[PDB]
Amino acid sequence: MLCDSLPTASRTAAAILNLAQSEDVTAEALAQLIQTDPALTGRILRFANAPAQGTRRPVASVIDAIDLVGLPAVRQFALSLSLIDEGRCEAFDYAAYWQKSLARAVALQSITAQAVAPKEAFTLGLLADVGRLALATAWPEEYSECLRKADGEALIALERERFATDHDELTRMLLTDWGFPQVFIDALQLSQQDRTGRFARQLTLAQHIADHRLALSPLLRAEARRCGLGDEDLARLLAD
Ligand code: NA
Numbered sequence: 001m002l003c004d005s006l007p008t009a010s011r012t013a014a015a016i017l018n019l020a021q022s023e024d025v026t027a028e029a030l031a032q033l034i035q036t037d038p039a040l041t042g043r044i045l046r047f048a049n050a051p052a053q054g055t056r057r058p059v060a061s062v063i064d065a066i067d068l069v070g071l072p073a074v075r076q077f078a079l080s081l082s083l084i085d086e087g088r089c090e091a092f093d094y095a096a097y098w099q100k101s102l103a104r105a106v107a108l109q110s111i112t113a114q115a116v117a118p119k120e121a122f123t124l125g126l127l128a129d130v131g132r133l134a135l136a137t138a139w140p141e142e143y144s145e146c147l148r149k150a151d152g153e154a155l156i157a158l159e160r161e162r163f164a165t166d167h168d169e170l171t172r173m174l175l176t177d178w179g180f181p182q183v184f185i186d187a188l189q190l191s192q193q194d195r196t197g198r199f200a201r202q203l204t205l206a207q208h209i210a211d212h213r214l215a216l217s218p219l220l221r222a223e224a225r226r227c228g229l230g231d232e233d234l235a236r237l238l239a240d
Pocket of ligand 1: 085
C-alpha cells in the first residue's frame, strides 16, 4: 500500500525497540543493529540528509547519522517500529532479501577496506537493491503477480510494464531521496550493467560473493583479481 513504510524483520525490530527503550542505550549498540536493516537505515539517512538540502556533505553510514542527529532522535525511530504492521507481498522472499542484503554489505565493506570509505560502502551494499523491498511494500499483490511469472531481465521489463518503473531505478531514486553521495549512485547504476568504475566493480563482486554465500567459481575468481584483491581475501570473504 502506498505511503506504507519499508518493513523491518520481526526479531530485529524487537531488539532495536527494546534496546532503545532503555535509558542506558549507546549509539554504538544502536548503530550495530540498525545498520543491518535497509528500512531503518533509509529512514535515518533521509532524516539526517534531507534537512541539509545539500548545504554540506551527506552522512552515508548509520553511526555517522546517529552522532549528527543525536541519539534521542534515533531512539524515536526505534520507538515507532511497532506501527509498521515480514510483509504482505506473498511471493517476495523477505528473509532471502534480508540475508543477501546484509552479506552484500559486509562483503563490499571488506572489499573497499583494501581499495572509498568502508563504513559507507557497507551502506551502499546493504541498500543496493532496496527498490525490490519498496515494490513489495507499495504493491504486494501486483508484485506477487510479477515475481510469480518473471525473473531477472524479464522481471525488470515486467515491473516496467506493471509499475512504470523497475527495482534498479527505484533503488536509485530512493538513494537520491535519502541524500546518498552522487558517486555511489553512479557506481550502482554502472554495476547494474556490465573512480566510479572501480567501485561499481567491487559492488558487483560483493553481490556475487553474496549470491554464493547464500547457496570458487572461474570468472568470480578473475573478478576478484580485476579489483586487485586476489587471494586468500576471496576465500576469507566466503567463510563466515
Ligand atoms: Na495493517
